[PDB]
Design a protein around this ligand. Sequence first.
Ligand code: CA
Length: 240
Amino acid sequence: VVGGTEAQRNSWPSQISLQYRSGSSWAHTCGGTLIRQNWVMTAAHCVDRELTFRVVVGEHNLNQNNGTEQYVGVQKIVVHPYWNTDDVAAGYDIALLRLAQSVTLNSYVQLGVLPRAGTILANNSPCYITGWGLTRTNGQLAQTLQQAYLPTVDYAICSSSSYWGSTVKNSMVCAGGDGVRSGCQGDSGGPLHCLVNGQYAVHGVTSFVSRLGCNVTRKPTVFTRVSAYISWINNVIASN
Ligand SMILES: [Ca+2]
């Protein structure tokens, strides 16, 4: 997250860290949201590769013990059937992970609330992005969970030529674009929490930013629109 602030430990308890085995260590690669006790939602491009993955719930500081973590393996990865590793702009940047065990819910560890199917936000709706991804373009990961206020940019404005053009589809949410605050590599797969009727619901999955750089004026961070996938989500979860 570029231009963020540290989150309080218990602000965003649906946030997870998606980590892969790197020698004999585990490094952060992506975020994700806990959607059931044994199901994580993340981006398809995070799990494109042949790596060994783990999920950390209850994480606040990547580098230090919090006293709250639960560490769990990934049993099955289900990527969306239309996802094409060579075209992120085509969309379907969404993957569901069945974990090796159920996690225990507590104040650090809660499920993420998902929008009702078809839901579209108004322009300039209040949302926060969270993640441990790079805090500058070509910079480094954060140690502690950062948040940024990142208001929405509706489709008519986001698919306008000054913004994203035809690169963004109606199956995506756009948020931010102020040049100062954004998502960045390592935030991918993570939540966009948006305030709706007094409750924060996860409306996005962080997908892509500009090749020019993470915080680019009029290149808002782009999200997979969670409300476009609600039937797919539930169909996966019933059947696995
Ligand atoms: Ca920790």
